[PDB]
RNA sequence: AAAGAGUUUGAUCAUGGCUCAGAUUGAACGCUGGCGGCAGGCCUAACAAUGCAAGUCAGCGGAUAAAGGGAGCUUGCUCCUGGAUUCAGCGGCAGACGGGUGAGUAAUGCCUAGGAAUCUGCCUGGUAGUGGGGGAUAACGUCCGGAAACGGGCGCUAAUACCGCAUACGUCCUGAGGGAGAAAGUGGGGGAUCUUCGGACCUCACGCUAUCAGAUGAGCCUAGGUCGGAUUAGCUAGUUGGUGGGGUAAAGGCCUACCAAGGCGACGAUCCGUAACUGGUCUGAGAGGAUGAUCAGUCACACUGGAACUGAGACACGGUCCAGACUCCUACGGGAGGCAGCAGUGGGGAAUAUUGGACAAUGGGCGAAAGCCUGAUCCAGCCAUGCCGCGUGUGUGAAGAAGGUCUUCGGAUUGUAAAGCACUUUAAGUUGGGAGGAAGGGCAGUAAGUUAAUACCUUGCUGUUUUGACGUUACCAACAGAAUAAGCACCGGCUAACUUCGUGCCAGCAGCCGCGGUAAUACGAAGGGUGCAAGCGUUAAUCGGAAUUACUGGGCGUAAAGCGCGCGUAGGUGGUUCAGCAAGUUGGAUG
């Protein structure tokens, strides 16, 4: 399937994700089709939450990419 | 030497055993059909290839072979039976 | 890391006062000073180029307390940032942290405003900032925490503010013990015994 | 879409050899060199000859090694 | 199989012993071009003003 | 959004080498033992003990023969209205991904640009369907061989397993007219009827079939680029083209049969050595030079070699077969195995870690979901291996204590120091408190839009309650007492740092110049300190300085360097004018 899914940046219990577009197939830290935006868990004052660029992940879901569970409950934060 | 290994190992079998029958009757029914367009006989021609199109197309379809090879033999016999004119 | 040990010997090297004491004075009377650090120190010769590059480099150096890790990484700091690298050299060693303790006066000499921001006494903007290396900005309080204001060395440290001279780039409410570090200084509210441009020689050879 | 060269080669049935010369600049001390490419091309017809300036563009591989179809005689 | 240099003040290397050797010439001894590292073996003397060396 | 020093001479200038200061590293090794964070960690050689891929009850058959309702005995007990619930051999799907390594490969592997003759499960839109039968077989029962593991003989039985028949435009072939080919159920609910409204029937969901377009993935082709060697110059015979056939998802000498005699090569074919490639990395002022650990894209391999099967996809790392080498179990009958997964071993070596924790997060795999898996991963161990930060109380005063001295016998030397403190106690220690990594999940109410029967069931939002963190806490706050933390290399030079005491061409030093043969600033030392510091030194390697391979940017009368001279093939280069052309050149745009 194609999916939308996150991928770990960041560092050490600094978690960062980027909301990649892969295969599915692919290991989650490599080789993906585009980068829509990013997301941040430990974001404070001055850094994004989510950035998360909806006229891409509007193709995509059109064109059959299955969002995760957790990215599904982040384009649910629109 | 998993529990899931030695089931696909023996299932395969059972299945390299059932389709080498089925690729084995498709041979044969385009040897009949070959057979006839060497030893010219026209008449026996189409009774080759009437038996052999239901034969080709049926085993194409559960994917025994590809259904571009199906429409490659039926193209190919169906060619040399307009050249025996 | 910090140079600990003996500071009585430090200042005869160099020439200067350096600011490296334990009380309410001056510089040089009670240790017999007249001479110099070395094997025998009693005859000289030779004070030219490379030695003075290297003596202007580690008079910098042991006012504020940098070892040469720190202290290189502040040319590379200078380099990058436009113009004036030698007295970029000078603004970054005084936006410091332990050095802003001592230029607001909170701290009676520079490795007494080492050990005070260290100890967790100092706040910026409401925090606790314990390291000695924090480069305040334009216009940043430099506060101190309310455990460590009725321990008297530290209003004891406060009166040479008027006796060292006026810093005239920060402003200190003596009564809250609450400084505002105002701007950076420029080279002309520096100290003139020292050679800004000696250390940008000693970095190729 | 389009390369041009001198026929260099004729003697295949149906297949004819175009060198097509490019100027390079060298990478390191920048002469501008000759540089070569002999392909195979497709004249169906059978009619290009040794010497003749031709067109070929690029079609799907009608053997080994022969890949570039014939266009168009420019000159003689 | 190499020559290598003794650098110490005085050692026990006894004629099969397990060396060992780093690079670098000594520049008097014609053909040599090792020095013996001192510490995998043997270390001993005063030296004081170390390494490679002991320790009081 | 670019610095040079040292060394050929009695001195000189020049040519030229060596040596050095510099930056780096997957580093080793010598010296010590404070911390934190974020990283990184078999570069060498292979053989391996012992612990990780499996989920779905929607297919039978076992087990339970619910507690319940009884009954008989009477709460011991078996059969039951019913018979629960929960657990494994078929089958679908996954195992082709994730994970490892870099042996092979000098080229279509890789990079860059483009192409056309194709396949692609799951996913997403469409379009048309899912009608009716049949024969087996595994479990199981049984027997035989075997000590067992395990094989191999009969007899039963099921399905979404398998096979015919039926149908089919939007598919295949013929492209004339015509011929050709699918599928499977299950689950939740249901008012009207056919009856044992078991079922049919309606309707939902998950499926299944045909197909078209997409998305993803893959396969193919072309051109250019891609190490050193000519002390490798010729290589090729399906070789190179053509046609006929075959084969492939698809183009194709991919194969084949014949015709033809071509194809590649001094712009380096062939052979030989070496080597996965790239983004990058390291140096550099740039040009370049060296290199491809970590991270990422591609490739190849999975003990060594050959092969295929199954499948949408493999010629398959915890798949099959065969051959080989090796290894192991044996009751000699018969068998089994592959850490270049993770941890760990022995081994090699200068050298590189724990037989750890959890699926809590983010993936991935099956599932309708609950979930169940997962050495991916997230994390904890170990290690200065890097890199960054931090840690060892006073803006003073002779009391110039000693101990260390020379007489400069007063002086220099510890030279605006201490043992007193009014002393700030974080970092480590103990204690107390406390976020964030948590989105979701059960439930039981509600609204909604399917639906025909908004009946119901399910689906999507909603508020209620309940619940799940391996790290186990970061962080904050208290209390204890200065308490628990300094070393390493140099000191003749050019390092604008520099007495002596032993030793005397010995012992020894040294990167170069060189030192040492009786006062030693060069060797080995308490009179006493310049670095830079949880480092510090020396080995190795890499580029730099090197204008010392010179494209930027060098030389050839005498330093190295003009063939002994011609003539000439390729090549390189070419006077002048008008025109055209538009490959080099140049400008802009687009990808």
């Known amino acids: 399937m194609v999916t939308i899914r996150l991928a770990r940046g960041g560092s050490k219990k600094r978690p960062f994700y980027h909301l990649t577009v892969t295969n599915s197939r692919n290991a989650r830290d490599g080789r993906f089709v585009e980068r829509i935006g990013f997301f941040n868990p430990v974001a404070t004052g001055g850094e994004v939450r989510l950035s998360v660029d909806q006229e891409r992940a509007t193709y995509w879901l059109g064109q059959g990419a299955q969002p995760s569970e957790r990215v599904a409950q982040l384009l649910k934060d629109a | 030497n998993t529990p899931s290994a030695k089931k696909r190992a023996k299932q395969a079998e059972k299945r390299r055993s059932h389709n080498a029958s089925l690729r084995s009757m498709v041979r044969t029914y385009i040897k009949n059909v070959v057979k006839a367009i060497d030893a010219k006989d026209l008449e026996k021609a189409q009774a080759a290839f009437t038996a052999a199109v239901p034969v080709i197309d049926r085993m194409a379809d559960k994917g025994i072979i590809h259904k571009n090879k199906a429409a490659r033999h039926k193209s190919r016999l169906s060619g040399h039976i307009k050249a025996l004119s | 890391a910090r140079y600990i040990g003996p500071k009585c010997k430090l200042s005869r090297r160099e020439g200067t006062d350096l600011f490296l004491k334990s009380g309410a004075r001056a510089l040089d009377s009670k240790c017999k000073a007249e001479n110099v650090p070395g094997q025998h120190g009693q005859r000289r010769g030779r004070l030219s180029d490379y030695g003075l590059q290297l003596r202007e480099k580690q008079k910098v150096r042991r006012i504020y307390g940098v070892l040469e890790r720190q202290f290189r990484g502040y040319y590379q700091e200078a380099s990058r940032r436009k113009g004036s690298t030698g007295e970029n050299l000078l603004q970054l060693l005084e936006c410091r942290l332990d050095n802003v303790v001592y230029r607001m006066g909170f701290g009676s000499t520079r490795s007494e405003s080492r050990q005070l921001v260290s100890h967790k006494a100092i706040t910026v903007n409401g925090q606790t900032v314990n390291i000695p290396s924090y480069q305040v900005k334009a216009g940043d309080v430099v506060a101190v925490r309310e455990k460590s204001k009725n321990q008297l060395r530290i209003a004891q440290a406060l009166e040479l503010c008027g006796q060292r001279g006026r810093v005239e780039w920060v402003e200190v409410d003596l009564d809250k013990k609450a400084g505002t570090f105002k701007s950076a200084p420029a080279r002309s509210d520096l100290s003139a015994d020292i050679n800004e441009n000696l250390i940008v020689e000693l970095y190729s050879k | ?76 | 199989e190499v020559s290598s240099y003794i650098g110490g003040e005085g050692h026990n290397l006894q004629e099969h012993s397990v060396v060992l050797i780093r690079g670098g010439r000594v520049k008097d001894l014609p053909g040599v071009r090792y020095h013996t590292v001192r510490g995998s073996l043997d270390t001993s003397g005063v030296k004081d003003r170390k390494q490679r060396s002991k320790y009081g």
Request: glycine share 4%; net charge positive.
């Open chain 4, 1 to 76: 879409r389009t390369l041009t060269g001198r026929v260099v080669s004729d003697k295949m049935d149906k297949t004819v050899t175009v060198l097509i010369e490019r100027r390079v600049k060298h990478p390191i001390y920048g002469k501008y060199v000759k540089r070569s490419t002999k392909l195979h091309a497709h004249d169906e017809s059978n009619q290009c000859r040794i010497g003749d300036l031709v067109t070929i563009r690029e079609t799907r591989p009608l053997a080994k090694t022969k890949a570039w179809t014939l266009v168009d005689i420019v000159e003689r």
